[PDB]
């Protein structure tokens, strides 16, 4: 019931860089991730354009951040487009081989880690601050799937019967034992509008 | 065999404050479209990864920059996914409604003009320089045509039996007669390293 997969070798490398490399600004993470998030609204949204009954597994677009001190994790949920079990697979649905390059290469002419967006492999940067991450995602076109690694060169891909959402995705990073300050009601509100104040969808911090 | 269409309402009050709005900083438009390039660059890559035959109209993936001082144009070339006729009808495959709607909003909280590639509608800001846009495009899936306008509420679609291209989007700006500092070879290359210089693919900028 439980696939295992190796990561291609130029994003295994990235990984390791990511967790590696001395770098304080970890806080761009949020920006990232958020972003991604806000691409995948636009997605369904065009397609709805022309066919409206795509949007018939849930009318909003929306973005929910979710902290939880008790597990020690904060959950960023979109009802965007989604992901089908191939897209999972192929580096959840990015150009990573080729991306990671330009990015390598690119720390070659003195750009710093937080450029890491403008390569189109963003959703790693979650490793500065997650030990695991677990990305959940259910695509109009297939069922629902868990994703799940914690870096090590391997990932793998379950299909999920835990919770039905209808459409979109859920990225639970569970954080390093050092970086619970993104659990923060203030510490999360400053982020949001420091980095992501322009975003077209409503962003809704859950409190606890 | 020509077909005239009304702009929505929403993208036809972008482009009048596009085109009225008194405002210098004027080089954007080049970082937007050669971005947007880029993102159909990156589409047809994503796509060749599981389908290797979508590359067989062209193998290559590139953006060139193409002035003539002659017919006072200069050309942004990519071998991108492309348009179908559908998507040039649809504010060219952007989400132009809601997009100009948050941009809008977006002048309400003090932002400027240069943040419109945020927003998903950077397209047009073409219209800063250009006093007619060409864009001929061909996706596999579809013929050549070639989409056009002045602004004035209204554009046109006709098919196109020019050049065949084989893959990819040509933006023709036909620029103002005061704006002929972008077809400089000095100028052009400037703006390309002062906004674009860590763009994954390879841009010639062409000599006359
Ligand atoms: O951070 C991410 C990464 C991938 C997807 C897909 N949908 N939403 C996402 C968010
Ligand atoms: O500036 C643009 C706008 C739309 C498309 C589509 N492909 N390439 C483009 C460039
Ligand atoms: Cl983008």
């Known amino acids: 019931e439980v696939e295992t997969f190796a990561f291609q070798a130029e994003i295994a490398q990235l990984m390791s860089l990511i967790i590696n490399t001395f770098y304080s600004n970890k806080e761009i993470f949020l920006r990232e991730l958020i972003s991604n998030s806000s691409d995948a609204?636009?997605?369904?949204?065009?397609?709805?354009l022309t066919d409206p009954s795509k949007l018939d597994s849930g009318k909003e677009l929306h973005i929910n951040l979710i902290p939880n001190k008790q597990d020690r994790t904060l959950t960023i949920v979109d009802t965007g487009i989604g992901m089908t079990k191939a897209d999972l697979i192929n580096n959840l649905g990015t150009?990573?081989?080729?991306?990671?390059?330009?990015?390598?290469?690119?720390?070659q002419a003195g750009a710093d880690i937080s450029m890491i967006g403008q390569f189109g492999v963003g959703f790693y940067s979650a490793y500065l601050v997650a030990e695991?991450?677990?990305?959940?995602?259910?695509?109009?076109?297939?069922e629902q799937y868990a994703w799940e690694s914690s870096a090590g060169g391997?990932?793998?891909?379950?299909?999920?019967?835990?919770?039905?959402?209808?459409?979109?995705?859920?990225?639970?990073?569970?954080?390093?034992?050092?970086?619970?300050?993104?659990l923060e009601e203030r510490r999360i509100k400053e982020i949001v509008k420091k980095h992501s104040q322009f975003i077209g969808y409503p962003i809704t911090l859950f409190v606890e």
């Open 41 to 48: 609204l636009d997605k369904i949204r065009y397609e709805s």
């Open 95 to 107: 150009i990573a081989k080729s991306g990671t390059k330009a990015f390598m290469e690119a720390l």
């Open 132 to 142: 695991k991450v677990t990305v959940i995602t259910k695509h109009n076109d297939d």
């Open 154 to 182: 391997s990932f793998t891909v379950r299909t999920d019967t835990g919770e039905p959402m209808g459409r979109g995705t859920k990225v639970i990073l569970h954080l390093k034992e050092d970086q619970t300050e993104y």
